[PDB]
Design goal:
The structure is a homotrimer. In chain A, about 5% of the residues lie in helices and about 40% in strands. Chain A has a 17-stranded parallel β-barrel. In chain A, strands 38-39-40-41-42 form a 5-stranded antiparallel beta sheet, with no helix packed on it. Chain A is built from 5 helices and 45 strands. By secondary structure, chain A is mostly beta strands. Chains in contact: A-B, A-C, B-C. Chains A and B meet through α1, β26, β28, β30 and β32 of A and α1, β1, β26, β28 and β32 of B. The complex binds calcium ion. The PDB classes it as hydrolase. The entry lists the keywords P22 tailspike protein, salmonella bacteriophage P22, protein folding, protein stability, right-handed parallel beta-helix, hydrolase, late protein, endoglycosidase. The assembly is trimeric.
Chain lengths: ~550, ~550, ~550
Amino acid sequence: DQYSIEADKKFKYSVKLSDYPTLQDAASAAVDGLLIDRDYNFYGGETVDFGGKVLTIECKAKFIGDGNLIFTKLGKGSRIAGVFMESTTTPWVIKPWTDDNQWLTDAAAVVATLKQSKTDGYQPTVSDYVKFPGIETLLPPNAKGQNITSTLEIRECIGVEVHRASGLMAGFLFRGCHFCKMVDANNPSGGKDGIITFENLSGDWGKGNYVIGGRTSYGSVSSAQFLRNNGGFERDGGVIGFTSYRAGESGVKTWQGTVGSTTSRNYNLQFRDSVVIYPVWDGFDLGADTDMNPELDRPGDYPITQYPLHQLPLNHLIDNLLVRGALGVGFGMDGKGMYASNITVEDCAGSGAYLLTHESVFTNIAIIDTNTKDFQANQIYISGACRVNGLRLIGIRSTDGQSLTIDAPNSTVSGITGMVDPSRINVANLAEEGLGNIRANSFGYDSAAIKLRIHKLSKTLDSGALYSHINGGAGSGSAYTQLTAISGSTPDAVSLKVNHKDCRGAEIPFVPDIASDDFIKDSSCFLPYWENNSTSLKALVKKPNGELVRLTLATL
Amino acid sequence: DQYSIEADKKFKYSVKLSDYPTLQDAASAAVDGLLIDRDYNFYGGETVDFGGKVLTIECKAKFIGDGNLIFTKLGKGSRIAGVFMESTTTPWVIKPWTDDNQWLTDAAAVVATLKQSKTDGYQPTVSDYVKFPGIETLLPPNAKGQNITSTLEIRECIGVEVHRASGLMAGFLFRGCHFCKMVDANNPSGGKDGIITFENLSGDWGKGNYVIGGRTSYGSVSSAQFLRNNGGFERDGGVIGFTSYRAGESGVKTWQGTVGSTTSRNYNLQFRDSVVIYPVWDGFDLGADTDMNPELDRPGDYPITQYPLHQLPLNHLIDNLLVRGALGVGFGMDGKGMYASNITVEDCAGSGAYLLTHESVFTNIAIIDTNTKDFQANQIYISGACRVNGLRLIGIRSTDGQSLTIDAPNSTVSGITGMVDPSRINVANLAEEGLGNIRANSFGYDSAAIKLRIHKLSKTLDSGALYSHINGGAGSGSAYTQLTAISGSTPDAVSLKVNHKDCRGAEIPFVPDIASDDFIKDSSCFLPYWENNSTSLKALVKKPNGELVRLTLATL
Amino acid sequence: DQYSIEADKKFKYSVKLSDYPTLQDAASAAVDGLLIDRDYNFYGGETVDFGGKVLTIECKAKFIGDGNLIFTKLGKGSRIAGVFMESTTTPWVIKPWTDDNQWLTDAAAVVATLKQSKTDGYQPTVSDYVKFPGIETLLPPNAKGQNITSTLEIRECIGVEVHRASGLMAGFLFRGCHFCKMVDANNPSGGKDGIITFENLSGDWGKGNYVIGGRTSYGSVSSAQFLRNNGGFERDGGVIGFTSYRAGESGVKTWQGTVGSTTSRNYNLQFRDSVVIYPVWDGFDLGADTDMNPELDRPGDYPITQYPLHQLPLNHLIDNLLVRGALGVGFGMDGKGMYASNITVEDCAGSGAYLLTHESVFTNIAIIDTNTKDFQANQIYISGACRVNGLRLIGIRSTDGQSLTIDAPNSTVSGITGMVDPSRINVANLAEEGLGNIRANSFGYDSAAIKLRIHKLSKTLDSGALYSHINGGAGSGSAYTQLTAISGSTPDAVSLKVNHKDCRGAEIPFVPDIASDDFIKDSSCFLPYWENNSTSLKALVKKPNGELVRLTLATL
Ligand SMILES: [Ca+2]
């Protein structure tokens, strides 16, 4: 009896699943630790009551089952580590990319990829019918409407963290939770449902809910997603340090519109220091209102009368995000009064950025080789009256067609860099107000150029230029400077030159016939013109007093 | 007796606080693990001696008390996880922001926010008397001079990590420690003192001390702070991956000046990959010398004779920092020979950056909508002779008054982007030395412009321009080019035109009266001028040999 | 007997090394936990078989020994925390930097630093003979050819993580492993071999192998390195959130060429959000093919016939990297079709970037004060036909010699910022195609300038300019505009002026002698020239019909 007293005081308490017939039996026995040391086959909806205990759940085996294993009544501070979810069903999956990692877009080609596997692809859903037009008709019935996910559901808990989770056809659902985290996800391979979901459609708005670190792969829909979460002014929630690969829909998604009877939208979350690669749809989908065929109202949210569609004060903190390889859109937002910074998007088949934003500011944005499949009208679209400060455009891809690169018709932009085709820029105002003394350095040409283009006049033709051109060859120490203007849609049609052929003189264009009175603009100026009938140059003079006189300028 | 031998070998050792009357009793019994499984009321200054043992302290309950719970003699490698500090006192707190997250600046409005709470605000301190002028007189006595914090103090330990700490009116103090870390702080709500402090005023300079990950909220003073730490050339210390919200003073602070009898300054620390949002004072305060009313000496540090005020070789590694919503200054530094890179500051009421630096380099800085309340003279200030390479200025806010945007009078700057008002730029030298061939693309105007402004002549008026202007309307295929110069403070007063009204000729300005000899600059050039008494143009000619002659140029 | 049944169910299982004579004995007894609670002296090659068990190994003492402690047959999900490796030998180390952190380059000075220590320096290797020319002759024999490392070797394991490792003369080797991680390395001080190595020369290509977080210091060779790893399209491996200090070779290295009988190269890895400071060689060395004296083949990899040298489809994900203080090259790559973004390199003695890349894209690169010791021909070199979009050049250092800043002769570049000497730019094409309306703001001069330089003509002299110059002094409200051209290698030799001396007229240069027919370029233009024998200006006129006529323009 004496040893048992000492033993009870000196040893760490932990129960292990190998000692119990059911997970509930183990949960009931647990006091401090719970070890999952044997695989456990659960039935869909199997529910475990943890009695409000603050438990440290250490997983060293699998939870096996289609459907949801539901954890309830875990005490604040509970931790679940190393969990591995696996379905019983091996579904039919598609793999819409090649052995060289080229996206497949042809429906028949995608159908040909069908195999039964728990990974290396995903179960088709109805969004695939849109993504791969014609695939709905071509998919065999056994590959349509599948619904396989093995989901760990944390239900109505506060202060629970799931660490280093993994699995096959695996999902993680936090339903009605607060102050919960999915930490260092160990590359679970997804199933039919979202891989990581914070859903708060009932009860209080979700808060304190984060994805921190880790990564996921595959899944039929989005990798990390939020419904009805509001981080407060404290920005207590969101996604930080996360990587998503090959989402069947999007890497990171804040839901839009009405789900069930209420709002699925999200406010005041962080989206930072994260990476989304090769999503079938979008990299980051951070809008709150429905784009196509929107609801006319927002039950449970601000009414349309207060904030028009796409003008919600979402107020997310969005910074240092990278996207590569989207088959859809790299980076999507809506809202009014938004800020986003340090966003880099590369090699996307649809728009790099699709921004349904108004009175918003975008700082240091890089959109590099996007809309490569011409899925959208442009590489970056901005609907409302926004500011862009720093915009890198164009990597190494050319564009064969007529699509715009940036269409931001109400936006004021500064600091574009890259080999953009200037005819493919459309903005409200473009300006470099604060440059210093400037030098234009020309390589691979016999001239250097400072060109002007008035887009109201022509988007495709420069209206005037300042050139410097080599006289002779390399090392001559001689160039001529040229000031030009467009006429008859012919760039550089009319020009004044300084030092052509090293002559040390100015070559001055004159009106080729009798100049009309209205040709001269300013007082105390003269305009030379040709009088062919005498082989003479004349001068139309507007005198200092503004009155016109015609003089003889040069004679035989 | 046989079972006890086997049991002692096969089970993990842990003691738990529920088995002991005092925390010291539990600490003394511990060998490997220590579980805090009941709330523990501690008295201020209660000191626990852990006997040099390498302990894994797992907290699943609260430490409750005003004042400091002092942990001593923990072995290297000890870990404390999940600690939760809470005060016994519920103090009076102010909440100087509105339900729309607008800062309150009026003292009377701030006083009206007073409530008794352990969170959602902070206890006033003497710095509030400066921040909210007049508040000292208006605060009730019971809201002044409060001193409530529940602090975990790790004293004179090496290699101790505190993980996932939280609390209410909570603080964490590492006093005289080395190689200690505050890891993944779980959003403790702060009290009167700094939330996370590495203080090494006695003993060896602090080294190896980090804040890694996590976040904090509220507190009366700074969220994370350092005194007398030196990371060495190895840069072994600092703040990485951290978020601070609503510091009563600053998000991250390296102390300045003398504290007690010695230096509180810091060297060779990292400040990287971190975020500070809504501090009442500053985002990052990384200076070492006192700005206002500085000490005349530096006991315990380099003397003023070796390094003048603000010119210490602090040598921090500063990169990838974000600040939004400061009521004070976003980003502050001093030092000589400093580097900072990839700093983004948005929506601050005081200066975005206040840099008391000399011979320092700033790369890729973005200061976006700051000094919004005109608290300072500018949005970014630099005192000494520094280099800025990449500077984004202006989001969507206008400035109504006369404040400068950048005042860096000794600095050389390149790569400004944004809709800056050029009259609000003051630098030593501004240049784009390495641009390629250039095109100026104009949207929303009937002209395109390349302007020149000589700030010595005028900060507010362009001194000359190269324009292209539409002739006719859109699609005309015709424009005129114009070269202009300022006269009588009237921009574009004098100009030469090419192709005005599609005339295909150059319109040339002439001197409106008899030209003085000194009007002509160069040899082998001529200057037309008006002789009104004969209705003639004359030419003042400087011949190739440099001698002047006056010729008749155009006649009736 | 009843208590033993209950005890076996309610307590956590862990064995501890203090109860066993050998580590294998402890490993054999272990079921769940294993505690290292006494220092353990191991012999080189001592091999522990963990029986496929999923073990949680908690280290609170040292593994002491020169050579490798080899862990085998650990179950997937096994974790080793807090491990501390230490050599038995205290070797001779060099410390090639001063007490002011200046690099020592002189061999004799480096030899003078020799001391016996397990840290604060490194054991010389053969690469030091190249790095410090002449040192091979000057090093005492007892400091050459040393081979001290205490290495934890994880051999042929899947799903094993080493967390918070540290040590002295310490190394960590994952040999033939997959899905293994080195997490939050706690600043181990390195020995002779790489500090963290994933080597997969035998068996399947390495995959799922990461360095996540943490830091290392010293070591004779590279801090983190990979051999024959391929992360797949999923990019499942690499280095994220890591810091390397004072690598004896490089911070992060993907091996090049043949090692043994097969390829050591790597594909599809992540290199992100990491920092390398003060490497003796390079910051990030991410090439796959050997630069100097390359192999003529690639056994085990793509043949040269498929992909030429330096043109492998390595396809790494490279983003948000910082390097400071390299004695060699900051950032090195090779490959074809590569992308890298958001790379910042400061204060390197060799090139900031050395890029043996083709058809690759570099976005937002900052190379700030590099090649400071003229070790290479330039600060950034690019061999093949690449695109650079955003390139910051020059901090505060000057260059005294003739070295180029960027030499990227086949590359097209846009968006250079900084005080680069334009004569030190060499690229295929440099352009700013998409700027808006422009203003050149001049500070510290009596003029503002927009210059043109045709590098084919001269790399050192501007070929033409548009100036604005003050007339009178500050506040005069008057300037003159000047359009210039180079002649006889004299910049600004020939010019047209508008408003010189506030005269309100254009000063027009004329040919100083009789103009040749070929001097005039365009029809409907005239060229003034001097007839000295009559003191007359003439006009060489190209009439609207293209025929030449000579007229009298101005007469006495
Ligand atoms: Ca005449």
